[PDB]
Amino acid sequence: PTKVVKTPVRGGMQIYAAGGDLIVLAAVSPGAELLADGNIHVYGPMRGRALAGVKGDATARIFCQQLAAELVSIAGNYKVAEDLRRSPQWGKAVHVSLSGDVLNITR
Amino acid sequence: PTKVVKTPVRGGMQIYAAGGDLIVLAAVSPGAELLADGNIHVYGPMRGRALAGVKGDATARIFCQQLAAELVSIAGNYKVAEDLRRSPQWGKAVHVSLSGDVLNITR
Amino acid sequence: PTKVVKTPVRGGMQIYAAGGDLIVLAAVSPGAELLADGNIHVYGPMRGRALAGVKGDATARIFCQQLAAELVSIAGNYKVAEDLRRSPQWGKAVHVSLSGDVLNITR
Amino acid sequence: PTKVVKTPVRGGMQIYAAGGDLIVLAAVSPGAELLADGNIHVYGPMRGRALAGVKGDATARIFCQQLAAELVSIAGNYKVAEDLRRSPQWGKAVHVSLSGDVLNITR
Amino acid sequence: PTKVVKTPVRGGMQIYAAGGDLIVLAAVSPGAELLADGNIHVYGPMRGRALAGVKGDATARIFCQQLAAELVSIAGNYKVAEDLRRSPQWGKAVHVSLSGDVLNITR
Amino acid sequence: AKILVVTSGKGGVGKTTTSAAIGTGLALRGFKTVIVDFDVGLRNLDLIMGCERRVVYDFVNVVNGEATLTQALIKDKRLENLHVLAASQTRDKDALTKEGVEKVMAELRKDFEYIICDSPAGIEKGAHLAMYFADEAIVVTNPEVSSVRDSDRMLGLLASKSQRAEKGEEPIKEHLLLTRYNPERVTKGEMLSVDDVEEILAIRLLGVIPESQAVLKASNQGVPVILDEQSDAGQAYSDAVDRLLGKEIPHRFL
Amino acid sequence: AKILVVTSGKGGVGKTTTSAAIGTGLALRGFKTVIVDFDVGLRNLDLIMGCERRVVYDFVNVVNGEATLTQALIKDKRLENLHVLAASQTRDKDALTKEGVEKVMAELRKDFEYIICDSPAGIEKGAHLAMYFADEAIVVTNPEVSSVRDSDRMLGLLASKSQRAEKGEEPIKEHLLLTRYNPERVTKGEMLSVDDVEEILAIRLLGVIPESQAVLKASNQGVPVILDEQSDAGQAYSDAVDRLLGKEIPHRFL
Amino acid sequence: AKILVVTSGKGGVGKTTTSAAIGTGLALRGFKTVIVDFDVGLRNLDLIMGCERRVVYDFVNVVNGEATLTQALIKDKRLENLHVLAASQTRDKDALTKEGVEKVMAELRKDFEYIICDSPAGIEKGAHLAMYFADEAIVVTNPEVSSVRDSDRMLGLLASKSQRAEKGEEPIKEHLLLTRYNPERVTKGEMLSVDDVEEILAIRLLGVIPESQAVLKASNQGVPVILDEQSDAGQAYSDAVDRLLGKEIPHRFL
Amino acid sequence: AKILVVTSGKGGVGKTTTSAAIGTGLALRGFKTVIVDFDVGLRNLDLIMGCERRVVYDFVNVVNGEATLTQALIKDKRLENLHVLAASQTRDKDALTKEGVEKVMAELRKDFEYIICDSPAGIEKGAHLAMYFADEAIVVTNPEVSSVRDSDRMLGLLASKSQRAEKGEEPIKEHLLLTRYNPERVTKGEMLSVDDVEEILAIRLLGVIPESQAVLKASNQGVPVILDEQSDAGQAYSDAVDRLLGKEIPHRFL
Numbered sequence A, B, C, D, E: 001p002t003k004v005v006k007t008p009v010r011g012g013m014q015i016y017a018a019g020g021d022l023i024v025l026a027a028v029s030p031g032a033e034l035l036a037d038g039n040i041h042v043y044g045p046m047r048g049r050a051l052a053g054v055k056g057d058a059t060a061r062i063f064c065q066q067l068a069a070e071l072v073s074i075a076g077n078y079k080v081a082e083d084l085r086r087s088p089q090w091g092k093a094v095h096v097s098l099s100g101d102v103l104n105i106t107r
Numbered sequence F, G, H, I: 001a002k003i004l005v006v007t008s009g010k011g012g013v014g015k016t017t018t019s020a021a022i023g024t025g026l027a028l029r030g031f032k033t034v035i036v037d038f039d040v041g042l043r044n045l046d047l048i049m050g051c052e053r054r055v056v057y058d059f060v061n062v063v064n065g066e067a068t069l070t071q072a073l074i075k076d077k078r079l080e081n082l083h084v085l086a087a088s089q090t091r092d093k094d095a096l097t098k099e100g101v102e103k104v105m106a107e108l109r110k111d112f113e114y115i116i117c118d119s120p121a122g123i124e125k126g127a128h129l130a131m132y133f134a135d136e137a138i139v140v141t142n143p144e145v146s147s148v149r150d151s152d153r154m155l156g157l158l159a160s161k162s163q164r165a166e167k168g169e170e171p172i173k174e175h176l177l178l179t180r181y182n183p184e185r186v187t188k189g190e191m192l193s194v195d196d197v198e199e200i201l202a203i204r205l206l207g208v209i210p211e212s213q214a215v216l217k218a219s220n221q222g223v224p225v226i227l228d229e230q231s232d233a234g235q236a237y238s239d240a241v242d243r244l245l246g247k248e249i250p251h252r253f254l
C-alpha cells in the first residue's frame, strides 16, 4: 500500500496515491503533479507540484533530493516556487513539514 | 500507517514498524536496528542495521541519506558493513533494492 | 627522392612521384590527380584524386589537411567522394590507410 | 624507404631515419628526438626535438600538426622552444623550411 | 595625560599623543601611524607605523601584542618591516627599546 | 530623508553597478528614490540606468542654476518611484562647489525618501562631495588584497571628513558589500574569503554579490541587474537591500 | 628622458597592473627605469611591485623635502635597472603641487631613461599632474561600452590639458591598450571586439591583454605578471613593450 | 612464476611503499609471494616490512653464495605466503651481476607464484637488473609534472632494455599507479588530474592512492599500509591488487 | 672555487629543489655561480630553473666535446651571476666518465665562484661523480626513519670515496639540511624532531625547511622558491645560504 513510481513522471501527468505514501524514483518534469494523502518521497530532481496530505492530514511530509518544485503543499497550506527560490536549500535535499499552520523547509 | 521516528535512535534501541513503512528523521547510532515489513527511509546519518521487508517481501526498499550502515537486508538477503565500504556510495545517498536474489546499491 | 610540388596543381594536371613519396604544398584543384607508389602528403586544400601505392604497396598512406578529395585510393582500393562526404572528417585533417582490404579514415 | 613510427615516441627515445623521410603517427613526448636526413612528418602532438636533413641538406622540411617542439633544426640551423613560443602558430599546424640561412614558420 | 584610543585606527589615520604615552586598545590597520613622544602600547594586532619619542627622547618604548608593524622608530632610529620579518618575534608579543643608537627587539 | 552614498576608494569595484542596483531595489519596495551621479565630467550612471537618451539637463546645470531640479530629474519608464539626476561630460569635477551641492541636497531631501549618491573613484574632491552630506555609506570591496586596503582608507574618511564629523552629530552608518566575489577562487586561496574581509575591516556585511556574466549583460541592454531576478547576482542584490531595511537574511551563493 | 603616463579615466581597468608590467618590461630590456606611483594617499603600486616592506620615504616626502630623491627610490632586488618611487597613505592628493612635482620630474629625467607614471583614476587633480609632464601616454581600456567612453574622454585631455599643449610643442604620443580582454565574450557580443575599439577610439593598439588568473596570482605573491612568462597575459604584456619600442608584432590570444 | 617489478625512475614516489603493499596484498589473496629488495647497499624494504630484526642473510649473500635461498628468505609472522629477500648495507649495487641475479630469479620462480621487485631509483645498473627479468612492471607516479616526465622515460626502458625485448618475446605488461595523489590540490591546478596522467602517459591506471598520514604511521610501526584497512590509502591499495588480477573496480577517493 | 654537492641517498627528499634554491641564493649574494645537473638521462633541474626552453647543448655534450662550455651554459634572465649546465634525456649515466667530468670541473673552477652539483639519487655511478670532485656537501634529509638511515650511509661515503679521501687532503665539509619538515607531525611523534636528527646523524644543521605548498607552486611556474620571499619555505631557504657563509641564525618555523 505504498505506491512506487519507477518511470519518469512527465509534464501534465498526475499520480494519485489514494491510500498512503507515494515514492517517485525518477525525475518529475515541470507541470507534473504528485498528490497523495500520506507522505511523498521524491528521490529524483522534482520540478512539478507535490501535494501531500490532500484529504486533511497535517502530519504528512514531503521529501525531495533536489528541491525545485513549482509548488509544495501539505493539507492545503501551499508555498509556490517564487518564495521557495528566495530561501536557501533550493536545489538541495529538503524536508517539508506542516507545523500548525506554516510550512517548514529543513535541510 | 507510516510510523515516523523523530528522535535519535540510540544504540541498543530497536524500532519495529509492524504494518508498513518506517521513516526515521534522526541519526541512528551504531547498534540500533530498524526493522519494518515495508520500506525504510532514513533521513539522517544511519550507522545501525536496516532490515526492510522482514515478513517476506522482495519489493521493500531502503533509502539512506548517508550510507554508513552496519547491515542492510531486504527480505533476508543481507549485506554487512564490510563489503559495503568496498563499493562507492559509502557515506552517500543510497537506495537499496532486491533484484531477484541480490541487493543493489544505487546513488 | 621525395618529390615536392610547391605550385598549385591545377585541374587536369597529373603528378607522378615514380619512386616514393609525394609532398604537395599547394592547393590541388578538382580534376587534378596525384599518384605515387609511396605516400602522399597534401598540405593544402585537396579537391582532386589521390592515388597512393599505385604499383602494389598496401602500406602507403594519404595525409590531407582538408579532406575534400574526389577519390582516394591505396593500391587499388578506392573510395569516391560520394561516400566520403557522408562520414565525418570531411574538410578535416585526415589520414587514409589500407587495413587489409578496406580503407580507414582517421582524424 | 620512408620509415613510419606508429607508437608513442616516449621521452628519452631517439628515432633515426637513416635514408630519407620519417613519419611519426603518434605523440612525441618531451625529451624524445627525431632525426632524419630527409623530411620529418609528425601527425601527433610533438613536444620533442625535430632534426631534419641532418646529413647536410638545406631542402629538408618539418611538418607538425601541433607545434610544441623543444627544438627544430634543418641541416644545422636550429630554433629552440623559447623563441618559437613568441611567434604565432604555437600549437598550430606548422611547416618548417630553410630559406638560405634562416628557418621559416608557415601555417 | 595618557591618551587611550579604543576604536579601530583605520588606514591613513594618524594619532598624536602630544604629551606622553599612547595606548591603542584596537587593531591598527596597515597605513595607519601612531606617533607619540612618550611610549606606545598597542594591545591589538598592529600593522601600521609606530613612532615613539618623536620629539627627542631615547628612553621611549614600543610594546605590541602582535608585531606586524610596517615601521617602528624610537626618536628617529627606525626599522622597516622588511628586516623585522627576517627576525623571530614576528607576530609575537614584542618590546622595542632604543639602546644608545640601535633598536632592540625583545620577546 | 536618508542620504546614503555608495563609495569605495578603489576604482572599478562596482560602485555604479551597486548604485543603480540599490537605487532600483529601494524603488521597487516603494520609497520615492533619486540617484545622483556625482562623477561629473566622466558620467557613467545614466548609461546603465538606460536613461542616456532622455537627458537634457544634468547635475552641473542644477548647481549653476541653468535649470531647475524638476527640469533635470528623469522619471523612469519602468518605475514611478525612481528618478535619476545624471551628470555632465563637458565640465569636470571642479565645477561642483561644496555650497552649490548643498542647495541641491536640501531640496532633494524635501521631496525624496532615499537619495543614493554614486561616488566617483579616489579620495579627491569629487569623491569628497558625495561623502560629505551623507547619512549612511555603502563601501564597495572586492575580495582582493588591494581593494580591502583601499576600502579601509575609505572607512576612516567616513569618520573624520564627513559633515556629521565636523558638526558632531552621530557618525555615518557604514555598510560593507563585497562585489564580484568569486567563490571558486577563494578556495584556491587567491582571493580573500568572506570572513577575512569581515575580520580585517571589522564591520557588518551588507551582502556578498557573486561574479556574474549577468552584470555585463544587464548594463549592455540598459537595465539594472536587480531587475534581472533569474540570475544569481540579481538575487544577491535584492537581499542586500532588504538587509539595508533591517531584515536579516542568511548569505547565499558562497 | 621619456616620461610616459599610464592613464585610463575609468577606474579599475588595470592601470597599476600595466604600469608595473611595462615598467618591468623596459628594465628587462636594459633601460634604467623608474615607476612613480602618483596615487597619493591611496597607494597600490608598491604592493604589486613587491616593494612594500622596503618603503621608508615616498613621493610626498620628496616633494615636501623631507627626504632626497636617492633616499626615497627603491632599487629592486631582481632587477638593477628598476626603481620605484612609492606614494603615501597619510596625505592625500592635494599635497602635490604642480611646482613640487615639476622639480622631481626634472631631476628624475637626468638619471633615468624611462619614467612610468601610474596615474590614479578620474579627471581630477591627481590624474592631471601625472598627465602634465608626460611625453607619451598609454590609455588603458576594457573592451566594454563604458570603459571606451571614458577612455575617449581621456584622449581629449591628453591633447589640450598637457604641458606640450599649453607650451605648443609636439603633442603627447598616445597608445591604446586593451586589458582583461575576454576572447570568448566578444563572440557572444557582450564585449566589444578588437576592431570596435580600434574604430571608435581610432588609434593604433599597443596590444590586447587577455583575461587571466595569472594577474591576480602574481599580485598576490608580489611579482609583476611580465615576470611570469608561462602564462598568456605575461606573453601579451611582453609584446606590448616591444611595440612601444617600434618592433611591430602580430597580435595573439584573440 | 610472474615476476613484476615496481619501478618509477623518479625517486621517492613511493616504490617501497607500493612494493610492500602489493606484495602483501597478493599474499592475503593466497598466492605464495616473495618481495626482493633490489636497493643493495641502501636498503629500505625490511624496515617497512617489519622484518629488520630477523635479517641474517640478504640478497648479496645469495648471489655470492655465502648462504642458500632458504637460509636468506624471511617468512612473515602475520602471513604464511609472504617471504622477503632483504638487501645489504655494506656492499653497494655493483656487487650484483646479471648472471648472479639470473640464478636467484631462476630458483625463485620454481617455488613462488608472484615475485615483487622493489626497484631502486634512477636509470642505472641497480634499476636495470630489477627491470631485466621482469614479466610485468608497475610504474609509480606522483601527480606532478616532474614525476610524469621521469615515469615517461621509464616506460621507454621497459620496452627496449628488457630481457623480453632483446630475446623478442611479448613485451613487459606495464601498469600505471598514481601515489600520494592529493585530490584537493588538483582542483587548485598545482597537480595533474587523474586524466592528465592518463593522457600524457597514455596507459591504463592500476589505481590512484591518496595522500595519507596512514602511510607514514604504518611504516613507523612496521606494518604495510594494506594491513591498515580503516584508512583511505589502505582501501585504495587493496583495490589496485584486485585490478592486477583482472577484477575491474571503479576508482574512489578522487 | 668551491664545489659543493647537494646529495642525499634517499630519493625524493628534495635535492633538485635545494640545489635550485641554494644555487639562486648564492647568486643573489653576488657570487658568480653555476649549477650542474648531474642526473644524466633523467634530467630535472632545468625544468624547475625555468631554463628548459633555452637548452640547446647539455652536460653530456661538453664531456664528449660536441660543444664548448660557453655554448652549453645558460645565463639566467633574472640573475646575471647564475648559470645552469643542464643534462640530457637520451644518454644515461654511463656516458659520463670520471675523466670527462674532471675536465669540465677544471674549467668551471677557473671561471666561477660556487659550483652547485645536483646529485642524482642512490649510491651508484651517477651519484659518485657528483660526490667525487666536491669540497663541501649538503646532505638532504627528511625527518623520517628511512631518510635518516639512508642519509647516514651517505655521510660515510663523503669520507672514504671522495677525491679528498683518496688524495688525503682535508675531508669534505658536510652540512645537514632537513627538508619538507612538518612541525605539526613531530609533536604527534610520527616524524623525528629537529634534535633526534641532530643526535643520530650527529652533525651541525644547515637549516630546517618546512612543508610548504609554495614549493610545488614555484616549480610549477619555473621559479626557484628562494625567489618567493613571501612564503615560509623561501625564508627558510634564504637563511640556510647565510648559514653556509658563516652567519649564524636561530632556526625558525618549528
Ligand SMILES: Nc1ncnc2c1ncn2[C@@H]1O[C@H](COP(=O)(O)OP(=O)(O)OP(=O)(O)O)[C@@H](O)[C@H]1O
Binding pocket: F010, F011, F012, F013, F014, F015, F016, F017, F018, F044, F119, F120, F121, F140, F179, F180, F181, F209, F210, F211, F212, F213, F215, F216, F219, F233, G010, G011, G012, G121, G144, G146
Ligand atoms: N557582481 C559583479 N559580477 C561581475 N562583474 C561585475 C560585478 N559588478 C560589477 N562588475 C563589472 O565590473 C565593472 C565595474 O564597473 P562599475 O562602473 O560598476 O565600477 P564602479 O563601481 O563605477 O567604479 P568606477 O566608478 O571607477 O567605474 C563593470 O564593467 C561591471 O560589468
Ligand SMILES: Nc1ncnc2c1ncn2[C@@H]1O[C@H](COP(=O)(O)OP(=O)(O)OP(=O)(O)O)[C@@H](O)[C@H]1O
Binding pocket: F010, F011, F012, F121, F144, F146, G010, G011, G012, G013, G014, G015, G016, G017, G018, G044, G119, G120, G121, G140, G179, G180, G181, G209, G210, G211, G212, G213, G215, G216, G219, G233
Ligand atoms: N589582463 C588582466 N586579466 C585579468 N585580470 C586583470 C588584468 N589586468 C588587471 N586585472 C585585475 O583587475 C583589477 C584591476 O586592478 P588594478 O589595480 O590593476 O586597476 P588600476 O589600473 O590600478 O585601476 P585603479 O587605479 O582604479 O585601481 C585587479 O584586481 C587585477 O587583478
Ligand SMILES: Nc1ncnc2c1ncn2[C@@H]1O[C@H](COP(=O)(O)OP(=O)(O)OP(=O)(O)O)[C@@H](O)[C@H]1O
Binding pocket: H010, H011, H012, H013, H014, H015, H016, H017, H018, H044, H119, H120, H121, H140, H179, H180, H181, H209, H210, H211, H212, H213, H215, H216, H219, H233, I010, I011, I012, I121, I144, I146
Ligand atoms: N600514498 C601515499 N600517501 C602519502 N604519503 C606517501 C604515500 N606513499 C608514500 N608516501 C610517503 O612518501 C615517502 C616515499 O618513500 P618511499 O620509500 O615509499 O619511496 P620509494 O618508492 O621507496 O622511492 P625511493 O626508493 O627513492 O625511496 C615515504 O616517506 C612515505 O611516507
Ligand SMILES: Nc1ncnc2c1ncn2[C@@H]1O[C@H](COP(=O)(O)OP(=O)(O)OP(=O)(O)O)[C@@H](O)[C@H]1O
Binding pocket: H010, H011, H012, H121, H144, H146, I010, I011, I012, I013, I014, I015, I016, I017, I018, I044, I119, I120, I121, I140, I179, I180, I181, I209, I210, I211, I212, I213, I215, I216, I219, I233
Ligand atoms: N620543503 C618542501 N616542502 C614541501 N614539498 C617539498 C619541499 N621540498 C621538496 N618538496 C617536494 O618534494 C618533491 C621532491 O622532488 P625533488 O626533485 O626536489 O627531489 P630530489 O631532491 O630531486 O630527489 P630526486 O632526484 O630523486 O627527484 C618535489 O615534487 C617537491 O615539490
Ligand SMILES: [Mg+2]
Binding pocket: F014, F015, F016, F017, F039, F044, F118, F119, F120
Ligand atoms: Mg562609478
Ligand SMILES: [Mg+2]
Binding pocket: G015, G016, G039, G044, G118, G119, G120
Ligand atoms: Mg592604480
Ligand SMILES: [Mg+2]
Binding pocket: H015, H016, H039, H044, H118, H119, H120
Ligand atoms: Mg625504495
Ligand SMILES: [Mg+2]
Binding pocket: I014, I015, I016, I017, I039, I044, I118, I119, I120
Ligand atoms: Mg634531483
